[PDB]
Ligand binder design. Structure first.
Ligand SMILES: Nc1ncnc2c1ncn2[C@@H]1O[C@H](COP(=O)(O)OP(=O)(O)O)[C@@H](O)[C@H]1O
Ligand SMILES: Nc1ncnc2c1ncn2[C@@H]1O[C@H](COP(=O)(O)OP(=O)(O)O)[C@@H](O)[C@H]1O
Ligand SMILES: Nc1ncnc2c1ncn2[C@@H]1O[C@H](COP(=O)(O)OP(=O)(O)O)[C@@H](O)[C@H]1O
Lengths: 153, 43, 49, 43, 49, 49
């Protein structure tokens, strides 16, 4: 084991380093959450094209052709529904993560704001002990006080 | 691109929508009150 | 190929959650709660010193 | 994931539901009392 | 002036919002109270020494 | 050849966006927010000094 004060400085340095790594990682989660959402919009747009095309497909009376379009777009709709559900759980998941990070950062400062205060008290008392033992009290008359040791000399 | 933009917004919490509501909510009276006094001050 | 992407799109999400919680555990144990009064919190250990 | 989250909560006992009840139970009067005085202080 | 237009509902959010800030103020006020009387004792030891 | 141009006409556009955001990140971290009060903002570090 080492001196308790020395650990405190080292421990917080590790703590601060870890926190930013958490901050960086959470950003990557947001990228995918946004990326898929942008990806989701693309598919429905394609389905709209077929639906829009199917609008005038039978405008000439060609009902048979419109059958394929509406049947075709169903496959695309399946992906849209699957992705919509997938984002729903992700959306409420990250929001919970952000709360932990924000609370941790607020809790982080309350420790550092006190660490300097404790060290000052520790340095004050440790020095005080060092001074007092060198008090050299004249009353000892036993050589414990270096002054009385001189007097004996 | 989105990776970087994500870091900035989090490190600098943008205004909450409620704060946005108040800001615009305040300006309407300021312009209307000035406009209300515009007609009155001129006439 | 279609099934391949659905896995990768989630792997990054899981790692982020894992990094979030693992760090949270590391932070909490260093909480240094003042109420312990047993040297488990390094702060109270200093106070005893 | 759940393994780690379990350790933290146990090592740091979260507030009891009764304590949660009191905390919110207190705020309603504070906002209402301030709001009650809001009408009174203004009028 | 939130409800000066009669908009009582909007003022509800503001008063509810400011309570969170008040919590921090109370927490810090107590924290300084102990620190204030602690250093003053330290200064006495240094001056006497 | 027709397909070749459609790529180059966009490459310059993407680089501009990349340079815009990367610089924006560099600026913001040097924001030196006065409210930090933790030495994260170099200004508050000066104030402590
Ligand atoms: N009122 C007093 N305050 C401080 N020291 C005193 C007082 N009266 C006597 N003494 C001295 O305290 C000394 C304690 O003895 P000793 O064990 O030799 O010193 P130390 O405490 O440094 O080991 C005695 O030798 C005695 O002379
Ligand atoms: N409401 C509370 N919340 C958190 N800790 C508390 C509370 N009340 C008391 N304690 C402290 O929790 C400590 C648990 O004891 P100990 O086993 O020494 O710490 P650890 O849990 O770190 O091993 C006690 O020493 C006690 O001072
Ligand atoms: N509304 C706000 N906008 C931006 N910063 C704020 C706001 N309120 C408080 N702060 C500051 O944000 C800081 C975040 O703490 P810290 O982790 O030290 O800074 P950083 O985010 O640079 O690591 C706090 O020290 C606090 O003073």
């Amino acid at each position: 084991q080492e001196a308790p004060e020395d650990l405190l400085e080292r421990l917080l340095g590790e703590m601060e380093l870890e926190l930013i790594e958490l901050r960086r990682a959470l950003a990557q989660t947001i990228a995918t959450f946004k990326s898929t959402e942008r990806q989701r919009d693309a598919q429905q747009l394609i389905a709209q094209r077929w639906y829009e095309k199917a609008q005038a497909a039978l405008d000439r009376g060609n009902e048979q052709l419109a059958r394929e379009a509406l049947g075709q777009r169903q496959s695309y709709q399946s992906h849209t529904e699957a992705l919509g559900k997938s984002l729903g759980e992700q959306r409420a998941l990250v929001e919970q993560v952000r709360g932990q990070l924000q609370k941790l950062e607020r809790k982080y400062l309350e420790l550092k704001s006190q660490k300097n205060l404790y060290l000052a008290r520790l340095k004050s008392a440790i020095a005080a002990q060092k001074i007092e033992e060198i008090a050299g009290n004249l009353d000892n008359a036993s050589a414990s006080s270096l002054f009385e040791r001189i007097e004996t000399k | 691109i989105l990776e970087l933009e994500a870091e900035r917004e989090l490190l600098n919490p943008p205004p909450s929508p409620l704060d946005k509501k108040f800001e615009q909510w305040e300006e309407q009276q300021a312009v209307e009150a000035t406009l209300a006094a515009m007609k009155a001050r001129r006439s």
